[PDB]
Amino acid sequence: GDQRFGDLVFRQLAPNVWQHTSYLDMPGFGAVASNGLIVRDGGRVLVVDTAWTDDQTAQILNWIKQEINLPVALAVVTHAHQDKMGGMDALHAAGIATYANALSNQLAPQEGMVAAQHSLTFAANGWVEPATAPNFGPLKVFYPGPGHTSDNITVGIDGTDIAFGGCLIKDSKAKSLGNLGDADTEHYAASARAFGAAFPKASMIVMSHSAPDSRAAITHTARMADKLR
Numbered sequence: 001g002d003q004r005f006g007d008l009v010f011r012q013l014a015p016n017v018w019q020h021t022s023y024l025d026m027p028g029f030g031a032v033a034s035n036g037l038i039v040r041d042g043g044r045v046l047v048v049d050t051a052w053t054d055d056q057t058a059q060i061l062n063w064i065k066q067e068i069n070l071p072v073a074l075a076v077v078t079h080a081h082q083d084k085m086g087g088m089d090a091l092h093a094a095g096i097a098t099y100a101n102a103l104s105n106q107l108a109p110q111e112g113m114v115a116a117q118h119s120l121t122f123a124a125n126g127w128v129e130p131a132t133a134p135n136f137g138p139l140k141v142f143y144p145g146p147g148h149t150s151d152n153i154t155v156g157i158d159g160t161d162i163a164f165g166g167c168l169i170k171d172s173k174a175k176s177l178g179n180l181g182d183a184d185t186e187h188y189a190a191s192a193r194a195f196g197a198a199f200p201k202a203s204m205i206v207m208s209h210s211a212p213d214s215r216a217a218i219t220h221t222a223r224m225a226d227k228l229r
C-alpha cells in the first residue's frame with residue numbers, strides 16, 4: 001500500500017523497487033504528481049528522477065535512510081524539466097553522483113535546472129554508451145528518440161519486469177499526452193514504440209504522470225501520438 005511520508009508518497013513495486021511521488025502546484029493545472037523510482041542493488045541504492053524541488057528530494061533521501069538504510073550510489077534523471085531535475089542540488093548536497101543525457105545537461109541552465117555532474121551519450125540505436133553509465137547495475141538506459149522532449153530518456157530495470165518511460169508514456173486510459181510544450185510531434189509515436197521495443201519483456205510500465213500500468217500504456221500512448229502527425 002501507498003506510504004505517505006511528509007508530502008510525498010512511496011509505493012513498493014517489486015522486492016527491490018519503489019516508486020516515489022511528489023507534487024507541485026501548477027497554477028491553472030492543479031497539484032501535479034510526478035513519479036520516479038528507487039532501486040536497491042545489493043548494498044546500494046539507485047534513484048531515477050528527482051522530485052520537483054530540493055526539499056522534496058531531500059525527503060526522498062530521508063525515506064531511503066529510514067526504509068532501506070543503504071547509501072545512494074547514483075541518480076539518473078530523464079530530461080531537463082523540473083519534475084525530473086528540480087532537486088539536483090539536494091542530490092549534490094548529499095554527495096550523490098548524478099547523470100543525465102548530455103543534451104539534458106546542455107539544456108538544464110535555460111530550463112532553470114542545475115545540470116547533472118555526468119553526461120550520458122547514446123549509440124545510434126539508442127542504447128547508452130556503457131562507459132558513460134559506469135556502475136549502473138541493473139539500470140538499462142535507452143534513448144528512444146525525441147518525443148515528450150528532444151532529450152527524454154528511459155530506463156529498464158534488469159531482473160524485474162519494470163521499465164520506466166518517464167514523461168514519454170501515459171497510461172492506457174489517458175485522454176492526452178500531457179505537456180507537449182517542448183515535444184517533437186512528428187517523432188513522438190515512433191519514439192514511444194521504440195521504448196516498447198527496447199524493453200520487450202517489461203510487463204509493468206512506470207511513468208511520470210500516471211500510475212503503473214500494463215504495456216497498453218505504450219500502445220495507447222503511441223496511438224494518441226499518431227494523431228499529432
Ligand SMILES: [Zn+2]
Pocket residue numbers: 079081148149167179
Ligand atoms: Zn517534461
Ligand SMILES: [Zn+2]
Pocket residue numbers: 034081083167208209
Ligand atoms: Zn513530466
